[PDB]
Amino acid sequence: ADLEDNMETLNDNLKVIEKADNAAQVKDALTKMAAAAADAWSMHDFRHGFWILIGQIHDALHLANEGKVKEAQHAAEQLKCTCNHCHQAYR
Amino acid sequence: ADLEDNMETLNDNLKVIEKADNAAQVKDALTKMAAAAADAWSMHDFRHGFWILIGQIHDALHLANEGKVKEAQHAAEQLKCTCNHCHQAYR
Amino acid sequence: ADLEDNMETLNDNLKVIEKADNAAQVKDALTKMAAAAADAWSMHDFRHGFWILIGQIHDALHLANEGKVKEAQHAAEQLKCTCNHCHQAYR
Amino acid sequence: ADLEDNMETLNDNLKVIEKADNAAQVKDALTKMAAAAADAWSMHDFRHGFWILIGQIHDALHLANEGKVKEAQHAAEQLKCTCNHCHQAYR
Numbered sequence: 001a002d003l004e005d006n007m008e009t010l011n012d013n014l015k016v017i018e019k020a021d022n023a024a025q026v027k028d029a030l031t032k033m034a035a036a037a038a039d040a041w042s043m044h045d046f047r048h049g050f051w052i053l054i055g056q057i058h059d060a061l062h063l064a065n066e067g068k069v070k071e072a073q074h075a076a077e078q079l080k081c082t083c084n085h086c087h088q089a090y091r
Numbered sequence: 092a093d094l095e096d097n098m099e100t101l102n103d104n105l106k107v108i109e110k111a112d113n114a115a116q117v118k119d120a121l122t123k124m125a126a127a128a129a130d131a132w133s134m135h136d137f138r139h140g141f142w143i144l145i146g147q148i149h150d151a152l153h154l155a156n157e158g159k160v161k162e163a164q165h166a167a168e169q170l171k172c173t174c175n176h177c178h179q180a181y182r
Numbered sequence: 183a184d185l186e187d188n189m190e191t192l193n194d195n196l197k198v199i200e201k202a203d204n205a206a207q208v209k210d211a212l213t214k215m216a217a218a219a220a221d222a223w224s225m226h227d228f229r230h231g232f233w234i235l236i237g238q239i240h241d242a243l244h245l246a247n248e249g250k251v252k253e254a255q256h257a258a259e260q261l262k263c264t265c266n267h268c269h270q271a272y273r
Numbered sequence: 274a275d276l277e278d279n280m281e282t283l284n285d286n287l288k289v290i291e292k293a294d295n296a297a298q299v300k301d302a303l304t305k306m307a308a309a310a311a312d313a314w315s316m317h318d319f320r321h322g323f324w325i326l327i328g329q330i331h332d333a334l335h336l337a338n339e340g341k342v343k344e345a346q347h348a349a350e351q352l353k354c355t356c357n358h359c360h361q362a363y364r
């Protein structure tokens with residue numbers, strides 16, 4: 001839908017993952033992030049950024065589905081360099 | 092050689108890249124970083140971390156050799172998530 | 183839809199790419215392949231195979247959209263090792 | 274050393290892997306292949322081809338070192354699309 005609202009969803013749920021205790025909290029937070037990226041996926045270049053982000057989130061869901069909470073949390077932190085790469089280029 | 096001294100080399104040269112103006116400054120700083128990672132490349136796991144870092148630095152040298160200073164600087168910032176992944180795991 | 187019919191679509195269109203002359207022939211053939219893989223994307227493991235294939239086809243569409251017919255043809259041949267990896271494992 | 278002799282080493286040892294029974298046969302064959310690629314690593318482009326091949330062989334050694342003979346054999350077959358990509362371009 002809206003771009004600013006997609007960024008809010010991504011930024012807010014990333015903290016929910018950082019503060020999560022179990023796999024169900026992580027698995028749900030990533031599902032909202034995946035939906036916000038695919039929704040933003042709509043010069044590009046810019047659009048391929050969101051394609052990369054969808055992939056990384058997707059691989060983190062496997063970890064959460066297997067019960068690997070610690071590694072799912074580790075994988076979510078590596079997303080930040082995709083986030084920053086866009087900002088550093090298109091801002 | 093020593094591990095603490097390899098980390099100093101990596102951390103100091105990363106800033107030299109951030110503050111660089113031309114390609115020759117970036118190209119030289121990455122060459123010292125590549126040498127410090129390969130030197131540290133000597134459970135692992137831990138050692139594969141340095142293998143990933145060598146690859147990313149290697150691809151950044153192509154950008155600097157082609158005169159792409161801005162993108163070489165962008166590529167150097169993406170290294171940080173490799174740096175942090177080790178620290179978050181083995182510390 | 184059906185699995186055997188998805189494999190036919192993939193195998194037939196891959197030859198259409200190999201025999202293609204212009205970008206419009208390649209771009210259209212990849213679009214049918216992408217649809218057949220995403221359709222087959224429905225233990226896994228097995229299912230992640232189709233996720234990898236979707237990504238590789240996706241990157242080949244950029245080449246075809248930029249007019250790079252030769253490289254789009256090169257990228258389509260690298261798909262075959264994904265194809266064979268599944269067969270060698272699950273057959 | 275010589276290019277034609279490096280290709281012989283790669284092609285011959287690849288079959289030794291395909292016909293291997295235990296991990297020690299696979300682990301040794303990959304070690305000769307890794308040496309032949311790094312030796313050939315000496316426009317490029319062409320040279321980056323050998324850089325990619327070194328990486329893939331390197332990851333296959335982990336599998337062989339962990340006793341995963343079947344997957345090490347699978348990983349060795351995926352090398353062929355790197356082999357063919359060079360030939361299709363520079364021949």
Ligand code: HEC
Pocket residue numbers: 003004005007008010011014046047049050053079080082083084086087090091
């Ligand atoms: C990945 C995990 C993230 C996170 C957490 C954020 N982004 Fe982006 N972002 C992009 C652009 C062009 C802007 C500016 C336009 C706008 O204001 O929406 C932003 C902005 C943000 C914000 C600030 C929004 C605000 O309230 O003012 C935040 C918090 C934010 N981002 C977080 C562009 C991109 C990308 C382009 C390819 C990618 C990828 C990301 N952002 C990824 C992320």
Ligand code: HEC
Pocket residue numbers: 094095096098099101102105137138140141144170171173174175177178181182
């Ligand atoms: C990549 C670009 C980097 C950078 C800039 C740094 N590291 Fe590491 N690091 C690792 C470990 C186990 C330690 C603790 C042991 C030690 O003290 O040497 C560190 C420590 C550091 C420091 C602090 C050193 C000090 O003076 O006390 C700094 C500044 C530093 N690192 C920077 C382990 C790893 C890795 C393991 C796989 C990887 C990769 C990195 N570090 C990468 C980086």
Ligand code: HEC
Pocket residue numbers: 185186187189190192193196228229231232235261262264265266268269272273
């Ligand atoms: C990628 C480009 C390809 C291509 C060209 C093909 N495949 Fe597959 N495939 C898979 C399985 C389990 C089967 C057996 C089940 C079945 O018969 O459908 C196949 C079979 C085929 C065929 C033969 C179909 C027939 O008519 O009998 C062909 C021509 C074929 N494939 C082409 C499984 C997979 C995968 C699993 C992850 C992947 C990926 C692919 N195949 C990819 C490809």
Ligand code: HEC
Pocket residue numbers: 276277278280281283284287319320322323326352353355356357359360363364
């Ligand atoms: C990866 C696993 C492989 C394997 C098994 C082979 N290659 Fe290459 N190759 C390249 C070039 C330019 C040539 C022609 C020059 C020459 O004759 O040496 C070749 C040739 C071969 C041969 C034939 C050699 C002969 O006896 O005439 C064979 C058997 C062979 N290759 C196997 C270039 C490249 C690459 C460039 C980047 C890469 C990568 C590979 N080859 C990889 C492989």
Ligand SMILES: [Ca+2]
Pocket residue numbers: 004008
């Ligand atoms: Ca806001």
Ligand SMILES: [Ca+2]
Pocket residue numbers: 005008
């Ligand atoms: Ca809001």
Ligand SMILES: [Ca+2]
Pocket residue numbers: 004005008
């Ligand atoms: Ca808002």
Ligand SMILES: [Ca+2]
Pocket residue numbers: 019020021
């Ligand atoms: Ca909590």
Ligand SMILES: [Ca+2]
Pocket residue numbers: 055237
């Ligand atoms: Ca992908």
Ligand SMILES: [Ca+2]
Pocket residue numbers: 095099
């Ligand atoms: Ca110190």
Ligand SMILES: [Ca+2]
Pocket residue numbers: 096099
């Ligand atoms: Ca010092």
Ligand SMILES: [Ca+2]
Pocket residue numbers: 095096099
């Ligand atoms: Ca010191």
Ligand SMILES: [Ca+2]
Pocket residue numbers: 110111112
């Ligand atoms: Ca300066």
Ligand SMILES: [Ca+2]
Pocket residue numbers: 186190
């Ligand atoms: Ca059939």
Ligand SMILES: [Ca+2]
Pocket residue numbers: 187190
């Ligand atoms: Ca049919």
Ligand SMILES: [Ca+2]
Pocket residue numbers: 186187190
């Ligand atoms: Ca049929």
